[PDB]
Amino acid sequence: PKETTIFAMHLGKALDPNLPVFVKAEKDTNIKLVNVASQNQTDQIQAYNLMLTEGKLPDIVSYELSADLENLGIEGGLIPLEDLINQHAPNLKKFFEENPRYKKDAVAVDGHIYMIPNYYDYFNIKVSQGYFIRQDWLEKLGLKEPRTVDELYTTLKAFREKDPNGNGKKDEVPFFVRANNVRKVLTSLVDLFKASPIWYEENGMVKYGPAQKEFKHAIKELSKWYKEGLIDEEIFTRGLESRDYLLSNNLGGATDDWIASTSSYNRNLADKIPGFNLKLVLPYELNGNAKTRHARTTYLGGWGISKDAKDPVSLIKYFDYWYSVEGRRLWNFGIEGSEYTLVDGKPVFTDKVLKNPDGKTPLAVLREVGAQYRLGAFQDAQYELGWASESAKAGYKYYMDNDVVLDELPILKYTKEKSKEFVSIDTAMRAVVEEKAQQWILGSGDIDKEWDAYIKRLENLGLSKAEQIQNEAF
Numbered sequence: 001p002k003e004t005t006i007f008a009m010h011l012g013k014a015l016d017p018n019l020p021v022f023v024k025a026e027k028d029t030n031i032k033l034v035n036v037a038s039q040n041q042t043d044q045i046q047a048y049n050l051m052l053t054e055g056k057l058p059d060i061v062s063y064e065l066s067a068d069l070e071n072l073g074i075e076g077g078l079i080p081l082e083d084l085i086n087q088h089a090p091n092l093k094k095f096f097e098e099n100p101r102y103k104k105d106a107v108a109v110d111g112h113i114y115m116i117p118n119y120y121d122y123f124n125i126k127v128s129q130g131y132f133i134r135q136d137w138l139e140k141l142g143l144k145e146p147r148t149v150d151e152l153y154t155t156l157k158a159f160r161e162k163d164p165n166g167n168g169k170k171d172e173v174p175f176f177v178r179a180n181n182v183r184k185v186l187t188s189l190v191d192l193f194k195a196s197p198i199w200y201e202e203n204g205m206v207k208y209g210p211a212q213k214e215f216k217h218a219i220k221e222l223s224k225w226y227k228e229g230l231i232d233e234e235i236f237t238r239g240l241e242s243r244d245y246l247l248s249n250n251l252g253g254a255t256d257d258w259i260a261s262t263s264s265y266n267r268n269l270a271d272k273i274p275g276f277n278l279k280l281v282l283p284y285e286l287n288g289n290a291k292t293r294h295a296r297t298t299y300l301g302g303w304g305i306s307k308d309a310k311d312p313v314s315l316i317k318y319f320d321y322w323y324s325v326e327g328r329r330l331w332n333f334g335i336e337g338s339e340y341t342l343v344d345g346k347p348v349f350t351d352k353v354l355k356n357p358d359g360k361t362p363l364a365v366l367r368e369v370g371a372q373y374r375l376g377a378f379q380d381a382q383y384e385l386g387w388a389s390e391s392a393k394a395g396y397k398y399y400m401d402n403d404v405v406l407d408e409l410p411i412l413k414y415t416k417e418k419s420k421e422f423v424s425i426d427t428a429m430r431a432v433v434e435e436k437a438q439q440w441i442l443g444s445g446d447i448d449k450e451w452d453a454y455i456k457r458l459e460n461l462g463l464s465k466a467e468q469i470q471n472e473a474f
């Protein structure tokens with residue numbers, strides 16, 4: 001039993017090493033994790049920043065913001081991993097040889113590997129979020145599927161004013177999202193208006209979404225839709241239970257969310273809410289623009305080994321376990337005999353996952369046993385296809401066939417000094433954007449009056465320089 005400290009959080013939950021997935025990994029690797037994040041910590045960014053002030057770093061550092069994680073490596077807080085991998089991690093060594101695109105995500109500008117990313121199975125499923133609407137509410141109200149942003153507005157107004165759930169109460173929440181921070185709230189609200197809360201590419205040049213006039217229009221419209229009760233009054237506070245609560249209580253009319261898990265609700269709620277039909281639609285058009293910027297990235301976050309770890313060879317072997325056939329299946333599918341059984345060598349989920357007796361969705365069940373816990377593992381799209389509905393599978397093809405998805409801007413990497421400057425500027429601007437976007441949507445500030453000063457604020461923090469660093473690394 002080798003006691004190993006780790007900082008690990010995901011989706012607001014500190015990693016619990018007693019979950020079945022990590023109990024099994026413990027038996028197989030003799031690595032017994034001890035989290036330095038405590039169970040009452042739910043803000044991963046503030047916990048990470050606090051962790052950096054505490055003196056000694058944990059043996060393993062996991063973080064969702066890979067640019068900050070790689071900066072920690074450039075400063076010597078994380079050790080280079082490439083020699084440890086070549087000598088001691090045959091599964092990772094093979095993975096990097098077989099996947100040069102993924103290897104590029106792992107290599108810093110100085111040539112060192114400071115982190116193993118948590119890879120999506122990008123080359124098998126590359127879409128992420130889509131737009132959904134309560135088709136049973138459309139039929140109930142005699143309305144057609146809205147195809148433009150303006151028609152969506154009118155439709156949501158009808159959802160709010162005309163009692164589609166039939167209980168004589170003005171309780172409908174026409175449009176809702178799912179998030180545990182402000183960035184994720186904005187992410188699923190501003191794409192409607194063809195804006196972006198982050199950096200994006202136009203025509204070979206990298207630009208900052210929140211500084212564009214499309215973002216101003218998005219926020220201005222959302223403030224109006226907020227006042228009229230068309231978007232959830234609790235958008236910024238409802239948290240990750242939002243979709244579960246609003247759909248299962250028959251309150252929510254439409255959303256922008258991950259395709260497979262959102263498609264799970266039709267079967268999940270079929271008995272509780274007879275006729276429930278939350279249906280995927282193509283992104284609503286705005287003046288002929290039919291695109292969404294929602295796309296899966298090649299990876300999200302990662303983990304590394306800190307300079308303070310006593311036994312890095314043992315830890316790279318732990319990293320390598322998740323890239324073995326058995327370790328990767330464990331991370332993706334859960335426990336054999338509980339979450340899945342092997343049928344002709346291939347995992348097939350059990351009733352516990354696919355028809356959960358406590359009314360849980362399949363992915364919620366998997367996360368509760370420790371599967372899909374973001375660290376530095378390699379997702380297997382067969383896990384997702386194993387529980388995705390037929391409508392979800394058609395939905396992937398629907399979005400791809402109709403060419404509505406724009407690829408995400410890759411997470412660029414920089415030389416040491418530029419990488420210190422960029423993350424400093426990007427972090428500072430992020431705080432300003434999330435402050436003003438909330439005030440503007442909630443009605444406590446006037447965006448028409450304040451936009452120009454906001455821009456100047458971003459410029460004062462270094463927006464021009466950040467863009468310049470961006471276009472150098474592109």
Ligand SMILES: CC(=O)N[C@@H]1[C@@H](O[C@@H]2OC(C(=O)O)=C[C@H](O)[C@H]2O)[C@@H](OS(=O)(=O)O)[C@@H](CO)O[C@H]1O
Pocket residue numbers: 011118178179184258259260261262300363372373374384
């Ligand atoms: C790598 C990871 O854990 N990413 C989180 C997302 O997880 C994906 O969600 C779905 C889905 O259908 O919802 C399918 C993909 O296979 C998953 O990897 C997702 O987490 S959650 O929806 O399961 O809670 C999003 C939610 O914001 O968060 C990512 O971190």
Ligand SMILES: [Ca+2]
Pocket residue numbers: 163164165166167168169170171172
């Ligand atoms: Ca009602």
